[PDB]
Amino acid sequence: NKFSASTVHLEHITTALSCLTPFGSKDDVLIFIDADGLSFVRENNHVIKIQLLLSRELFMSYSYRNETEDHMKLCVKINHILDSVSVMNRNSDDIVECTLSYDGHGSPFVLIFEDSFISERVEYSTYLIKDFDTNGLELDRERISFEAIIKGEALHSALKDLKEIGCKECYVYAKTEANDENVFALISKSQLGFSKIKLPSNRSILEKLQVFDGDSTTVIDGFAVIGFFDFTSFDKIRKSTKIASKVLFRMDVHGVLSVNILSPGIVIEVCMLEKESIDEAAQTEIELLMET
Amino acid sequence: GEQWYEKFKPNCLEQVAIHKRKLKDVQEALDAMFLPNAKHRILLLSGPSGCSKSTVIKELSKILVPKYHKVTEFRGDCIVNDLPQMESFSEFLKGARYLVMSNLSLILIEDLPNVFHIDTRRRFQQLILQWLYSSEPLLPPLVICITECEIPENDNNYRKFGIDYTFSAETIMNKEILMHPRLKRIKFNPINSTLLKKHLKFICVQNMKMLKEKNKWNKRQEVIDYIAQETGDIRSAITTLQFWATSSGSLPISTRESTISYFHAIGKVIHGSHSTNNDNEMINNLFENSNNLLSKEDFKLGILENYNTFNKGEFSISDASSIVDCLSECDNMNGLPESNEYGLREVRKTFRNISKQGHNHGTVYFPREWKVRKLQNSFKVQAEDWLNVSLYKYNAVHSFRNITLEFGYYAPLIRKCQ
Amino acid sequence: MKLKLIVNGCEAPDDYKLLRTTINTVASLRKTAILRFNSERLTIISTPKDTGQLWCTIPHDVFRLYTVISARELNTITMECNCDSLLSVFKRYDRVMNQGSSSNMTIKLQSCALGITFEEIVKVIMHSFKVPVKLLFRAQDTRIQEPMINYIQLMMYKLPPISGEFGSAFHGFIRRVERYSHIHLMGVKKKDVELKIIVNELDWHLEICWNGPLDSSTHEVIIRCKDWKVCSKLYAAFEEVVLAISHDESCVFHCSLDERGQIIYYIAR
Amino acid sequence: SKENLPWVEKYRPETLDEVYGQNEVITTVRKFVDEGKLPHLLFYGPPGTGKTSTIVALAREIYGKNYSNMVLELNASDDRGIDVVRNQIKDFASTRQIFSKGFKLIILDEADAMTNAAQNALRRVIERYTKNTRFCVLANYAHKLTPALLSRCTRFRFQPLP
Amino acid sequence: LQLPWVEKYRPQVLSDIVGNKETIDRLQQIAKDGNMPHMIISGMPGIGKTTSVHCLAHELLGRSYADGVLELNASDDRGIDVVRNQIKHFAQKKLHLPPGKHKIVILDEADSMTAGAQQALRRTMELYSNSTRFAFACNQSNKIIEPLQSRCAILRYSKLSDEDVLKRLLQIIKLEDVKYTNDGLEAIIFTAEGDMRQAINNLQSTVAGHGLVNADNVFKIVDSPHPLIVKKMLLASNLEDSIQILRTDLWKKGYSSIDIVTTSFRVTKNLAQVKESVRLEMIKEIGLTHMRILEGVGTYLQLASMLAKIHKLNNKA
Amino acid sequence: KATITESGKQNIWFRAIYVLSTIQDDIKITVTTNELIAWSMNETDTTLCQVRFQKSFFEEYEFKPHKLYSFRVNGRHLTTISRKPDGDGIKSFTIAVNNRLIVVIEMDSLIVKEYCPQFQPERELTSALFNEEVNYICCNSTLLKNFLDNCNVNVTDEVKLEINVHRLSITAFTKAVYGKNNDLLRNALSMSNTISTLDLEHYCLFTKSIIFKLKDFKNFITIGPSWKTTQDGNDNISLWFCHPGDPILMQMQKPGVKLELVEVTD
DNA sequence: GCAGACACTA
């Protein structure tokens, strides 16, 4: 069948695919099949890229029979896959088995489910005509502006409060202190006025936060990093951080932001694009108002 | 600083810009509404912008409410937290309904809720209809002011139905409320030249120190009379006067250039414009003025029905035949801007050619197509009933064409004898 | 015009009585529903004209002190009321299942309003709700709106109430179809029989095959709309067993049997 | 990739030197990109002249490996309404660089079918976000384009092939 | 990162803006006084309306305009509810403004905004005109509803004369230090037809593609405008000359037939030398050819027939 | 001014703001040395509700410039700030006015949210004076809350306080309207109720009833059970002088919260 | 624009 993947615990797959639902008109996922595992990447308007990686150890029947460069692609829809696995795995002790199949190239994506003498076979025809390949909103680690590690629960509360209030434009602030009083917050401007969601500074749930000087090795204290990010990009990672343990924040001088989600556990990587320029000269007043 | 039209608001009934007859027949209308039993439950005001359609009622409530300034003006920009805009107006009506005694606050709905979506437009009719036939003791006065202004043309309007063509009382309100017995429709007219000139005199003599500072005291008369004659809006006139007074000089003032009416356009096409002697510039300016009306059906029918009133049907039959032939040829262009231009140009050229025999004209009539459609619908439902009753006892298939042509008179004739 | 009946709590018929509420949400979402009160134990109610046909009878013989009389000459009386207000009386009565047996449900037909009497206790609270509209229809409309229709052959006997996984499979079809937003069915006479449902799309190929289910000509292919999501909700019927019939490649019925009464649903092509 | 396509899509130019006929336009665009300034190129002409082939070859030559990410292609095949120009175009033409500080090119192929409101939103976009992103408009009928758009875009005429 | 001349050389003060001396003087006077009421600015695109509004707001407020105003343009969701809410909040939030200064609501490209939003703006003005003022930047005043214009002083911008555009071109040339030719400048002015932005784009293209600005280079990069060619075609005496002009100026240059018909209709609307009967006959023939083009027949024979019929009705045997 | 509260009294504060935000879009809050007063004037000037928080409600009242400072804060903007987040709690909630409303939220953990709503400052407390101008009916709000939770206010009906002979027969019904020829354009869906005679605490012989709205009658009762008041927390009272013309007064006495509502009848 | 009837002092 050129591809095999048997899954018993479909709850983990259901909640993993549920992190890609906030995308409007969800479709066109570039699923990667590799010996390491399965990775799902989805991009919206070439401004935000999210990658969800499933390890080989997650599947109990991973074979990956192939005689090629070990780089094979297929494009299918999200809403079909998202609702495919959530419907079953109900009641108790059902041990529902999920089977993945793909006959190399040109064949539909076959999904087989078994639940109490009840069998299904779902086929997904792939879209591989004008796959431009390459792509990727990646970044170089040599010029990382700063790095931060925060708990998922702390960030989820900030994002949930950031959404319902509005805040169509949001700001990211990073500032270190010689007295270990590191400052990092997700502040924003809306019709309400100024909102200052000040994240905690203690080491209880903020594991590490240091600001670099564009070399990723020279840590500097007293410097401030201001990031101007759209609200639409932040709304996508709100549900991703809803069920998570540690959230890693990393951005460079180029302005792209890399967010790593940890929840063996799976890893979710989200890439974001900074807006054009700071509104007026708000970078001056962000430092001035928060310092007061 | 402060706007002149805001700082010079009237304080009594002798300062408002309104005709004597209009003041009299709104005073008699509002006086009888305050009685416990009133012939008209609500008052409807329809007219152009800046015609004192709201301030007159404001001082009227100022001098009639304390008999037994309490005005409950609806604010459409209210949201009301977690309340839909459709239910906001419903809650406003019931909120102001409980003011029949002691308070007696008049209701002045100047800013009516926007009616463009299908759901919110249909709700606006029965909301005031439910307040009419309600058997409740006493009645608080309610005045609705609607400004007669045509909505400018937009893109991708799909079917392009009514209301969106022209924001007027007739378009939005349906027939049940228009000729309801408990309703009075007091139309409003633009401010007259004499009243505008008197008000500009009063403003100029009130601003004597400012006008005499510059070289405007000698020039003021020409500017104010030009402003008064050019437009009929008092607010726009005051704005233009304030702009000119602030201006140092050597500046050509501008005016709204308000759009003409439907019958006004019909008269312009048939009779002509005295302001613009040149024929080419009159039609070209009219096109860029209101293309939204010319690029619309029933205008060519209006030209077709009113072209015989140029000389009471006493002009050249050959010219009439040429005009009707040109309109018929224009009708084949699928309603294009080029089609409208050619027919109107031909009509104007012909009527200019025969303009010598135009001493006495006639009245124009808006075409009766609605009546023709109504009788067509009545005949259609009558034929449907006839087919329904004639198919329950035997078989009879002849299509719809034979029913209208052959069975429209023969069939009732045979049943008459039997 | 005396339409007076009393509804009281019991042990068995409450599940049959509480099954009535599920359609009431759907019926309120639909246009309306008709009624025909006859004699003392027979009444038929259905949705007037999608293709919503819900011929269902209820044994009013067990109901206490029920009588029908009207000026409709024959034994059949046209009756119609809006089902939106029927939710309010049922939902509020469902909150008082903890205590209260003598409260009853007193209904009186007076002209337009149908007063409903409650005697809930928290010292007693009296509630008097009125049904808004009971407007009738033309007498000739009774014949043209006859809801009695049934067919035979190709009887699928559903799985008996022994394993609860069969209902969950149908309930899975309820949640999935709402999430995506044609349905095809298979039928075989080979003995227990197998059920197969298949969905064909441009790229969505769903097929479900039952290997060893306990449920009981051939090749009855049929293509129909998504209106069957209502019929899956009627399968619950915890008191008794449900019947299903599908043939003629155009029509399908869902015969829900509970106590003496039976409930059927009709789907067109 | 080859010997499996129609002859129309078999000899499509990939570089600027492979486009013939409109020598003046090619030289002017080459000078524009050698100086480092794109004045919102607008291409007009009959079908078959090679406007979209020329602009795709130019974008490839400028970008290289950044065509997949920084270059956006728009057409009549996908939905182009008021919401689309309001959201997708605004989101794309608001981002910074990733690897190279080159300009952002957005290809508005057969843009003459857009609505008047969409055209007005698009031209308010081109005026506001011109300091980093330069759009390209391709059309065959100039009468379907808003005259305000032609003022803000450098019109280039694509003559028939000699 | 070379910024284009349309954005790099845009004016930042009202002094650099030319074309309408009276209007610029009035704007400077009203900024010095500070009593700026509501206004509507309309005109043909590319004359300097929105940049004039921005410069006026700049040199009228300064830091207050930079930091504490809410300017909305066409690139926003201009729904009724959201615009109503946004302007309602912006009418509030008053600061320590000078007594002769007021908030400015810049409204760019308001011609495409829905009528319900106009009514909401009417209510917002009638409720909070004391604190804030509105500025309108559009192309034509017809798209604005009648009641809005009564509360404002409408300002009309005339087409820029050749002198002002030429002076701006010389200033930009001196700033850029580029060689020029008087014939090339005259060709640029002729091609612009009073459009400042088009003139700037053409001059920038000439400079960056050929270096020295010359008439030959400008004519090579961009041809003569089609309204002038069509106007010359319609006024031709002989049919053969008109046919040759049509072919060698539009068929060999790559001009669509429907665009030619539309340009002919526009020229005939604005033509003045022809009589009324001749004008209406030409309009009818243009419409007939237009519907023939729309129905599918888009060949040169239809254009030739239109020209032949126009010549026949002009000569009248 | 600087007022902080750190207790279970945050829920009623959020409840009161949501109640006041429904009546009017903008909430005008007046501060004074005596206590804190929050109220919103209705658009039709038919509903007057004020919630007054005692000085003991907060832990400090360091208010500095009898001056009565007032400001108009958006009700919708304020009601989304004092909300209780799901799966988390607010340890300290405070609001302050600087010499730009300075309101901050301190959760159980070290995370803190700082908000800056915009207000507009004339101590129009004459409405409160008319409220305290000063029959007597006492009914338990706990039993009324059962009827209010299911009143089906979506039809926007009216309430007729029918005391009849002795017992309170609260009704939620809609008046029908006639059409062209006796047509029911608006359907009348009535929902009446009756309370026991002995359940009423105070009553006055005032046969013939009065009519008042329900949306303002709904939100005024939810404030009671929202706050866990084991001590005191007495039921609401009804006060209204004779004839239907004058408005009706309602009061809910609490140890730290003053609840008032005035609704104009007819 | 235009026909029919009224207000108001020249």
Ligand SMILES: Nc1ncnc2c1ncn2[C@@H]1O[C@H](COP(=O)(O)OP(=O)(O)OP(O)(O)=S)[C@@H](O)[C@H]1O
């Ligand atoms: N003598 C006067 N008579 C009438 N209005 C006057 C006078 N002097 C000043 N005004 C002002 O002119 C304006 C006229 O207001 P109205 O015309 O009554 O309002 P409106 O008719 O509702 O306008 P729309 O069409 O609704 S925007 C007001 O702002 C008045 O304050």
Ligand SMILES: Nc1ncnc2c1ncn2[C@@H]1O[C@H](COP(=O)(O)OP(=O)(O)OP(O)(O)=S)[C@@H](O)[C@H]1O
């Ligand atoms: N100058 C040229 N030199 C070589 N091949 C050309 C040239 N112009 C066009 N072609 C060929 O014509 C094909 C189709 O032309 P395209 O450039 O794709 O479309 P177009 O000519 O721009 O017309 P439209 O506006 O898209 S319908 C290309 O794929 C090329 O193979």
Ligand SMILES: Nc1ncnc2c1ncn2[C@@H]1O[C@H](COP(=O)(O)OP(=O)(O)OP(O)(O)=S)[C@@H](O)[C@H]1O
């Ligand atoms: N009087 C002027 N002096 C100098 N540059 C001008 C002048 N008028 C316009 N411009 C230039 O025109 C360009 C943009 O002008 P805009 O004001 O955006 O055009 P517009 O007249 O407003 O037409 P629209 O409606 O905005 S397309 C800038 O590059 C300006 O420098």
Ligand SMILES: [Mg+2]
């Ligand atoms: Mg008014």
Ligand SMILES: [Mg+2]
């Ligand atoms: Mg192309």
Ligand SMILES: [Mg+2]
């Ligand atoms: Mg502009």
